[PDB]
Symmetry: none
Subunit: 176 residues, 2 copies
């Protein structure tokens, strides 16, 4: 079903996957790959493609560079809060949030702080549970995410998804 | 600067703004690209021309002829034809965005909201493949403002309406 547990599980899987897919290590600390069904695999392939396009948006990469490299806690929550501050929701924003969390993880890996992988995922899944889960339930599950994106629209949806993340980062940056 | 990325961003913002102002699945919404002072001036320019074009009855009759729920081939044929002489001017760009916006509005009317993203996709693909080199040689979108004075809204409208109506007539008559 469209139960809480399953939306949480799929969330954790997608995020972990994205951090695998963007990542192209403390072995005893690894979180094993959530196993993926047909449905989740299609979501994962969706996210990989939109992530690769976001990686090519230079304005967004300048903004992610500005993120407090080894102290990202306050920046994750302020960016997350701001992007959802109008009380509306869309799948582009959910994708933006997972992407950003994934880049924060990658920035920590570089800084060789691997216990942040767990911590950042924890912040993101807590945010999903507290703030997004109701909406994803009303939508009938994670499957809806696929229809936010279409086969001929990747370059175009990217602009708007990059745009929302870059905007919340700009406010975090300028407001200090 | 006026890199491909910024031309594409401003185009998406301008188009989204052209559409959003006139007029629905919320989970599918593309958030509004945020606007600086200069994009704001462009957007106000576009709203004004748009309002005038909406008053051109000949143009409204041709837009009504547009295949309501199957707009793909009409969009590309109209867009191709309008730029077929290999020249460019800002009137044509505006005509292309206006037309794409009316197509979106006609799709919303028929309750087909996934068309919002698809038509934007076609319009921005065309901007990227066909117009972007020219806008860069022009120094960016700011030049669009010089195509429109302040004392000439009824006058520039006739010619901008004329170009879009002409390409629609060719589409309609060639079948």
């Amino acid at each position: 079903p469209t139960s809480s547990e399953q939306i949480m599980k799929t969330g954790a899987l997608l995020l972990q996957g994205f951090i695998q897919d963007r990542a192209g290590e403390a072995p005893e600390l690894a979180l094993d790959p959530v196993p993926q069904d047909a449905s989740t695999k299609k979501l994962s392939e969706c996210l990989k493609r939109i992530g690769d396009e976001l990686d090519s948006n230079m304005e967004l990469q300048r903004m992610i560079a500005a993120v407090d490299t080894d102290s990202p806690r306050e920046v994750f929550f302020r960016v997350a809060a701001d992007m959802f501050s109008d009380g509306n929701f869309n799948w582009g924003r959910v994708v933006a949030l997972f992407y950003f969390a994934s880049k924060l993880v990658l920035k920590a890996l570089c800084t060789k702080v691997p216990e942040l992988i767990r911590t950042i995922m924890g912040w993101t899944l807590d945010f999903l549970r507290e703030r997004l889960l109701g909406w994803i339930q009303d939508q009938g599950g994670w499957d809806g995410l696929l229809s936010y994106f279409g086969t001929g629209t990747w370059q175009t949806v990217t602009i708007f998804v990059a745009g929302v993340l870059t905007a919340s980062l700009t406010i975090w940056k300028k407001m200090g």
